[PDB]
Structure formats: C-alpha cells, structure tokens
Amino acid sequence: MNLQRFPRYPLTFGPTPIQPLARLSKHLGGKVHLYAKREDCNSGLAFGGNKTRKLEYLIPEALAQGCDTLVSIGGIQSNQTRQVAAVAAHLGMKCVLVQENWVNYSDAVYDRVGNIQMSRILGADVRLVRSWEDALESVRAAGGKPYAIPAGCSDHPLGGLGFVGFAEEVRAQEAELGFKFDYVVVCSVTGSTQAGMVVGFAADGRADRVIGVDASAKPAQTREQITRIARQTAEKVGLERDIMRADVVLDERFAGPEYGLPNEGTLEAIRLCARTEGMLTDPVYEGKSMHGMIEMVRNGEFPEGSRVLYAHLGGVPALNGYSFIFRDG
Amino acid sequence: MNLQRFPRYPLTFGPTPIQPLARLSKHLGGKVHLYAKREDCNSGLAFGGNKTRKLEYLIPEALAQGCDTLVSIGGIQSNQTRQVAAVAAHLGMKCVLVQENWVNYSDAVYDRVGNIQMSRILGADVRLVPDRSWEDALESVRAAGGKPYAIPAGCSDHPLGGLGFVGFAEEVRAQEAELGFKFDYVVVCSVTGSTQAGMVVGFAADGRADRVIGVDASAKPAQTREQITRIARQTAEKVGLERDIMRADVVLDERFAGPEYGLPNEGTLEAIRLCARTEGMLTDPVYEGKSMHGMIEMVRNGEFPEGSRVLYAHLGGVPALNGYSFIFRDG
Amino acid sequence: MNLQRFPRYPLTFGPTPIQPLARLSKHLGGKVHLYAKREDCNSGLAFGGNKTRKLEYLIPEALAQGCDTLVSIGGIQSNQTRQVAAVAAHLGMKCVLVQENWVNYSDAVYDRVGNIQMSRILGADVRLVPDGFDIGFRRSWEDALESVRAAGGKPYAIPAGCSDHPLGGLGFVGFAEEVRAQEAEKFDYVVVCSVTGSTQAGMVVGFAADGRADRVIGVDASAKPAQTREQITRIARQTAEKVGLERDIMRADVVLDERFAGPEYGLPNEGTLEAIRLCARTEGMLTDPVYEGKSMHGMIEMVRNGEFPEGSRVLYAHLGGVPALNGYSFIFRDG
Amino acid sequence: MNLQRFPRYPLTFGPTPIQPLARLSKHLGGKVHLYAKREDCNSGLAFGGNKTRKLEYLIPEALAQGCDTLVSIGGIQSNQTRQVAAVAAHLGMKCVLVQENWVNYSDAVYDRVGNIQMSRILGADVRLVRSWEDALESVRAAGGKPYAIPAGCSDHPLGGLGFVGFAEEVRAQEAELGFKFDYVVVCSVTGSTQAGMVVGFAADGRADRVIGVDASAKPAQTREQITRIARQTAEKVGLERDIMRADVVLDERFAGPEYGLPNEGTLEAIRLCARTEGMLTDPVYEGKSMHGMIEMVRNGEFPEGSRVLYAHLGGVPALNGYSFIFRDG
Ligand SMILES: *Cc1c(COP(=O)(O)O)cnc(C)c1O
Ligand SMILES: *Cc1c(COP(=O)(O)O)cnc(C)c1O
Ligand SMILES: *Cc1c(COP(=O)(O)O)cnc(C)c1O
C-alpha cells in the first residue's frame, strides 16, 4: 500500500508515545503485558485526541478547495466538534458546529462544561438542536465556503487515512522497541479509527489483532460502518487485499447501557486505571474500551505473554458533564 | 552551574515544544514575535502542567526517604493537587490533599468538576477544610502506618521546588541552539513563585534573568515578589549559580492580577478568547489567562522592542475552566 | 368514625383552598370539570405540602413523649424530609435526616438545590450517604435513632413519607372531612399521586365513611404498583380501625392506576413533561417531574380518553413537591 | 382616602396570614414581639409573593385595554418576572420577559433554576441579553397588544396600590387581634411595596413606623423612588395629605455588599430565622430585611414591648441560584 501519496497537515506534535501500564498489568495478574499509545496527548490544540489525527488528512483538501469555514457535528459532549473548533481557530478558519442531544442524559451543566465549553471559547458557532444541510447552506448563503466534516470524521473519503498512519507509526516504534504488540484495543463508535487500523495492520497480517470495543450500543451498525470504511480506505491506499468480516473484530459486551451512558463496570474500569496508572479515561468512550481490556485480561482471553497496546483516543474533558457520578470518587 | 547533581524522576514526555504564535503576533501588529513553550502538554498524567516538571525533582527524595504517601494542598481548583494525585497513582503511592476555599467564588459545581474531580477519580483522599488541616493530614498518615512526603503549596517553598524550572532554561537553550537564536523574553505567570524562580536562576546563567517577565496572578505582588526572590537565591545556591540573584533580576508585573486571586477581570477574559481564537490554544481565568493578558497588553503598549522574540510559558491550568462555566456560556 | 379523638397540632394555615382549573378544563374539551385542592400551599413552613398535613397528627405524640429530635428518611429530593426539617425547627426540635440517592439519576446539583438545600438551611443534620452505601440494607435508619439517644436526646421516629406509621393515615382522613365541609357549598372523583401510600390511604378511609372510597383515583408514581397498592390497602385498613370506621376496606375501594408511573420512580416520561407544561401554561400551576406531574398527566390522560363521565367534577389533590424541579434543570432549559 | 375606586383582580387566596415569631423573639431576648405577615404564601400561582399583590391592581387595566401579552423585566433570578409569567398563563395571556444580569454573580446554574426555570415552564418567552423598548415593539409587530410592566411594578401609576391595600388589610386584622403593631419591617429595592405601605399607614399616622430595609445597595436612589411613588400613589388614592420625605424610613445598614449578593450577616440571619421558625428567606431580599430586624432588636433599637410586623415578601426560589454558599447549611 501507499499512504504517502496523500498529504498530511501537521496538527499534532508528532508520533504519539507508547507507555507501559505495569501497575495495572501487575494488578491484573502479570500474565498480560499492557501498554498505552497516547493519542489523547497528541496536540496543543485543546487536548486533541484521535479525531485530530484524522483531521490531518482532511485539512489539505479543505485548503486545496479554498474553504474558509469548517462545519461538523456531534452530540453535546462531542470530542470531534471541540477538536474541529481548535483546528479551525489554528488554521484561521471559521467554524460552525451542529450539536445534537445524542444522549439520554440529564445534567445541569452538560452543555456548559468540558468539550462544548471549549468550542465556544475557541470561537466556534455552536448550534444546539437535516440540521446538517441547513448549517452548510447557511455558510454558502453567508458568503463563505464550508468544508463538510461528518460525525467523527469517519464516513469521508479521507477519514480512514489518519489511522492507517497509526499502524505505520506503531510498526516504526516496534522496530525501535525491538518487539511487536500482539493486539491493539480500541474504542469504536463512528468507525474510521478502527477502519484505519484494520487497513494499516492488514498490511502485516494483524488486522484481526485490532480488537475493537463498541461504545455505540448499536454494534451491528458500527460494525458495518467500520467494515465499509475499511474497504473504501483499503482501496484508497492500495492494500493488495480485500477486507473480510474476519478482519473486523468488534466486542459488544461493554457498550451498555446506551451510548453516552456508563455502566458500573465502566466506572470501576475508569477508577482502577486512574488509580493504578494515573491515566484518566471517560464514561462515554475510553472508559468502555478500558473496561473491555481489563475484563479480557481478567477472563484470560489474552494468551499469557501477550503484549496489548491500548489506544487511548482522548475524551477526558467529557468527565465534566458527569460530575455527580464521581462526586465521591 | 550543575543541576545534573540532582536526580530527576521521569514524569513528562521529554522536552516541551515551542510553538510560534504567528496568528496572534500578526493580530497585535506583527512587530513582536510570540511563541509558547507548552508545559501544559508535558505529561500523560492527568494533563500535567508546570507542577509536574517541578515534581520530577521531588519524587526521588520522597522515594529515597521511603515515603508511601504524597500529601499536598491548594485551593478547590488547584492544579497542583491534581498533578500530585496523578503522580502518586502513577508511582503506586497514596495521596492526601487538603483543599481550601482560597477564592471568593461560589459556583454550583466548583468542587466537583475540573481539577478536583480528577483528584477524586485518581483515588486521592480529598479533604475540604470545614465550611491545622495540614498537620492533621500529615499525622493521619503516620497514625495509619504510612510515611508522608510533604509537598507545600505549588511545590514552591521547598528546598527542591526551584530545580524543575532551572532545567526549563536549560531546555530552552538547547532549543535556541536548533533555532539559531535566543528569545528576548519569557513571560510566566506567578503565584507561589518557584516556577519563575527556577527560570530566574536558569537564565541568570546567560545573563537573562531580568528577561524572564513574571506576571503576578496572586494579587499580593509584594509577597509573591519576595518569595520568588528568596526561592531563587536558595535555588541558585543549590545549583552553583556562579553569580548572585539581584532584586533587579526578579521581574513581576502586577497590572494583570486583578481583582483577586482566582477571579478574572474583563481583560483576562478577552485575552483568553483572543488567544484561543487566533491560535486554538486555551488558557484559564485564574493563571494563564492573566499572563496571556499581560503579554498581549505589553505588546499592545509597545513595551516589547520591535523585533523582540517573546517566549510565553504555558503552565497548564485549563481544566479549571470547568469551574467558571457561566462566564463562558456564550463564549 | 371519629378522628376528633386524635389531637392535631397546627402546622398549616387552615383548610386548603379548592380552585377550578377552568382553562385546563376548557382546553381538554370542557366535558369534564377539573379543580385543585392546594395541599401544596397549606403552610408557611418551607412550602409545606401533603406530608405536613400528615405531620399534624404525629407531633402531638412526639411532644407527649417528650422527644427533642425528629428523625426521618428519604431520597435526595425527598419532600418529606424537607417538611420534617421545617416542622422541627418551628417546634424547637433537632432534626436528623438519613438520605441517599433513591433514583437512577445524577444531576450535577441534585444534592444541593431544592428540597435538600432547604433542609440544610433549616438546621437539619442531613446525613447523605455515597452511592452504594445502601441505608435500607445497613439499617442506617436505626443507627440514626440510636445516635440521638447515644447523644442525650430522645428521637421521634418518622418513617419514609410518614406512611407506614400508626398515625400516618389520619391527616388525610381529615382531608375527606375537610372536603365534605367545603362541598357543603360535591366532587365526583379525586385524583391523587401515590408512592408510600398513607396519603391515598387516609383518603380511602375518610371517603369510605360517605361511600366514596372508590372515587379516589390513585395514580402510581412508584413504578412498583403491586407493592404500592398493597401498602395503600394495608395502611387504609389499619387507619380505618384506628378511626372506628364502621366498615371493612374492600380491595375494590383502593384504586391505583399504573399507566403514568414510568419509566421509574423519580424519572419523568415525555408524558409527564407535556403534562407539567400544559397544566403550567393554562393555569399557572406548577407540578413536578417525580410526583404531581405524573398524577397531572394521569388526570389529563383520563379526561382525554373519556374515562370520566361527561359533566363529572374532578378534584385534583396537589400534594406539593415543586421545589424538586430545581434538580431537573437541564430538561427544562428551554421550557 | 379611597383605594376602593380601583378594580382589584383576584390573584391571591385572600388576605395573607400573620404569624408570631415566638421562638426568634425569645431567642433575641424576648423584649420585642416579632410577627410575620406571609405575603410569600399569598398565591397558588408559582409561589406568588409581594409582586402578586401589586399585580392585582394592574391586570384590570391590561384587560380593559384588551392587551393580550404581558411584558416585564428583571434580573436573572427576578421574582417579578416569574410571577408575571404565572399570572399571564393563568389569565390566558402571552408573556415576554426581558432578563438581564443585574448582579455581579455567575453561578453555573444561575439562569436554569429557581425563578427563571419556572418562567420558562410557565410558557413565558424569556429573552436574555434598547432591551425593554425592543420587546414591546416586537409584540406589536407580531400583531399583539402588550401591557408594559416595569421592574418590580414600581414605576407604574398603579404599582403602588397593592400595598396601600396591605395597610388596609393590617388594620382590619389588628381589629380582630385586638391590638396594633408598632412597626413594620419591609425589604425595599424598586420601591412601590414600601411606598404603598407608607401611603396606607399614613392614613392612621404610622407612615414612619414602616421601617424599610434597603437591599439595592444604592439607598439614595431607592429612598427617592419610594418617596416619589408614595407621593404619586397618595395623590391617586386621595390621601388627605401630601407625603413628606420624613414619612419614608430606609435603613441602609444591611444591603451590602451589592444588590443580589449576601454578606455574612445576611447568611446568619437566613439561618437563624430558618432554624428558629422554619421560615426561609433569600440572600437577595428577605434575608437582608430579616438581617435588619434581628440587628434592630439585638441593638435595642426597638423599645421594650414593641410589636414588630415583618412583611415576608417572598423570594425563596432564588435560593437555588446560590447553592454553593449553602452546601453545608
Ligand atoms: C470519536 C471517539 C471514539 C470512537 O472513534 P470512532 O472513529 O468514531 O469509532 C473513541 N474515543 C474518543 C475519546 C472519541 O472522541
Ligand atoms: C501553579 C501554577 C502557576 C503559578 O506557578 P507558581 O510556581 O506557583 O508561581 C501558573 N499557572 C498554572 C496553570 C499553575 O498551576
Ligand atoms: C410523598 C408525596 C406524594 C405521595 O404521597 P404518599 O403518601 O407517599 O403516597 C405525592 N406528591 C408529593 C409532592 C409528595 O411529597
């Protein structure tokens, strides 16, 4: 394959570090070696995260197209939209965000802290709710040229490129470390994060080692999205193989009870990981993927000796919209 | 000098990047070149920030002395205590935090979002003073069978609390080497003081101590200024500074600290917005927004020599934004 | 029957007013006439409400016993504990409230606004436990009673909602009495929200006396109808006997509709919300997402479905609870 | 005088009750007998309060004029705008409310709980920010006829009538009681509440017995508004005398530090009163007037044996916007 053909606009500090999770690994049995690749610390643009890695491959097209406004969408505590707002500010672009009520969660400061708060400070036009088209049209009619960024950046032709690059990065780091990771655990919702990974790791025969953990609570849709995006992306980068259902692993046991709502396992997972490693995760995405990984290790689902690379996608600021749940820890 | 004599426990990713703030520089007239060194992105331990750089030089002693608990203190939205809680969890140590109402602010979720929320999740025993806390805290640890390592407010008034930022100057020299030039100034927010102190000592070396432009955020200029001065002299001695720190070496502008510690003024808010909107870089209403406000005003007043290169030290503090949600409800 | 036998301490202004809900009645077609008996406005003690009417019959006992502390229990936005705190302060008694989140809900300011905020201002010792403590399991209720004694005082034990208490059903028997006296100026049905039960129970006993027990249409807000229904019946029978009601309470006398309790105790459904908004926008009368909004939703839905004979006059008992709206601010952010 | 010349629209349950504050009185030495007149429990329309007594005299005119929309104004936690929204709903009229932040305060849920929450639920169109004028115009432009209701109902020709009636009510109740109150404590900010009282008690020679307690923190301006409204109202009811400045008593010692902000004395008084009587007061209005009365009795400013009638004007729902302050009581 060949990713290098597509330009990448630097929005990150560079390759993201991989850290050992020795305390947590030991706590769980010392049988499985856990690591974490910090996508959550990839940028100076309002905390970045996985969405920011994706955006690097989309910005060039926005610039090439002479666009002046970035328009995106997501739930109230969307990480995607907060990142688009920061990238836009940094690029000197206007920003219009469509924020919808995507979660059955009632919290007094939900639309005023965390991710959405930053987007407003960053100068984005935050619209709280077809709304998609309206917003875009709004921009054209306003005299500007919008660059449409779908939810999570996922269902877009360039949306899968960022994480194919992730697999690339990991290969280079395994070469520096002198060892390979047996698996990768990643949280999945809109899909192009895992899709990129699947294509990237299909290259060296480990697509099936990319263990996705669903956090959408609609596993069938998410799995089809990932699969579809992986196929389109595999074509885009010249993978010399088709993606098979066997290449898309999506665990469904940890997404409940709903998207945006933690279960008690989620909370326990967030607490354990934070208290053993000092590494925070959130109740919507990462805490669920962290939950899955801990559970898998606990159930012995990982062969003894396995090295598991947890991909920390970001999302911590959303913790602010769930303050009551953590009031005592 | 020789900071190398003191061990440094790795708590950061490595040197912190310097980024140009061209959009903001141009916005202010394009006469002064603004940069930012990102201490606020130095670690994977609950966002880190300047305190985490300070802590790298304290943990070895704490470990050497066999302590099993880190004990610290600060206001409700203290960045310090949150970093202590994360560093403790990472090191396998317990943590006790004494949090006091240091600000005349009373937001509905002030004690449940941002920094303090993270400390609780990180497993610290977060103690809210009513409404000697410090001694009870330390003693409770002994009484329980542990050994506490005491970390004073901001890590500042501690024998080792000024080291972290001497190394910051060391870091900046090596980056200037690749940059092919030296920054004319450094802007840093100051409250407990060992951050600006370390910098004062670090830059005294190549005679730029008075180029480190401190911006007071304590709203108690005199005390803070005095503490920086003292911490500097002590640290200077600790590292072998072949020169002495003169009062003239400690620079602290007091025009941007109002109205009180922990409360922003309208300038602070505008500054936070201007910078976030021109660079995608956030600052808080208690600390960085005030030093950012200082720098912009300085540039605006033509107080920087045309052509000057100014290095803004972004110390962190962003999670505290969550405690001032009403002020930013519309931006 | 004779309630006059049991002493009643004044904690209310006097009988509660009945007002017509003419606008809401008209909006629903005008075929049924709705009114409201404002139990929610019965007292100067921190907004009072139904619980305060119940307390009038318990306090004489607490006083005769020489108790100096009132001890009660309830969820975070419990109306009962807030009224106990004000009654206590008013009487010069101390107050301990054992509390815990009894709802699968987690609003940012849930434990610091509305009802619980007032209890703390009122001087009560609000003992709110962290999630997973489980007071009902550890029997924290008793330790609290014990700690008062252990401390030198004498506690008067007031159970959840005052209901499952010997004198807990008297207040609302008196309500039926008061209604009769006001009718001497008759309502066909009464709509009342039911959770812990002695409110509707007292009504059942009180109205059984003039043959209207089955005219009290209870609307479950517990989302545990079977338990609640049984509680109402039992409290009724005990209270009937207590007030010498020369009659047995039939299973037929206790009416508890289960259609508007969803999805859970303390959680409103879209129906609850529309009902709160409709009643508020037509009569200027506010109801809450936990209790009254569900019974308001009940009455409106019943009238809408024609379960009420044309021409019927329905007396909606507004038991109170409005302060709890403060804990559901996000839901009403745009109205 | 002749108050009866004006039509009063019923919006209350009827005369408000007078309760003794026996415990608070004994607590402060029992040398002064304190009582409370509960204007705060005067209506089933969203808790009511003094504003509702004022409004009973303005509504007939709004109706007579055929207006279909009530338009008013106040700060975020304004009690007035909440009562206006409830009266509108009850009357079947539309409601437009201009809310501005009149307080240097910024609590996270300030514009979502208490009074303003009720107004939105009651169906008012709550517009947060020439303010006033724009609102009024927009209603006409929509094809409606708005009835303008100034802040607190105070600078309105009819705004002072409600409390002239309050004095009426009190003489009548004093008859039944068989005794007279020597003083009346009342919180004053916009002014027509105390002005109505001044006029109503001028009739029996007790105008200077109406002890006003400033809560505006701008006493000179408030003292002048009460004076003016009182004179204009006395003329409108045919008082057989002109109102003199000496008829207006306004203590300025308890308004600090600013309108909308409590001082430590305010909080203490709110707590003492709540804990001795079970009667709540707020940090903006009543707690300051409660603070005043207690301080007056404590300093021996009332003659031994005096009977003081505290007018509790309402305002308790605003407590919700000061939750941090009362988190532990
Ligand atoms: C968007 C997001 C995810 C899921 O990534 P997808 O590419 O949408 O599947 C996981 N974690 C965080 C923190 C995210 O913002
Ligand atoms: C502690 C802190 C400061 C001030 O540093 P001192 O060493 O205490 O002077 C500035 N900004 C942030 C974000 C901080 O946490
Ligand atoms: C307690 C309560 C109810 C239910 O009354 P029970 O006697 O417990 O059945 C209804 N509404 C409100 C406002 C309440 O506080």
Ligand SMILES: *Cc1c(COP(=O)(O)O)cnc(C)c1O
């Ligand atoms: C408006 C108000 C006041 C002050 O009354 P004015 O007539 O404006 O002086 C006092 N208390 C409460 C509760 C109020 O709403």
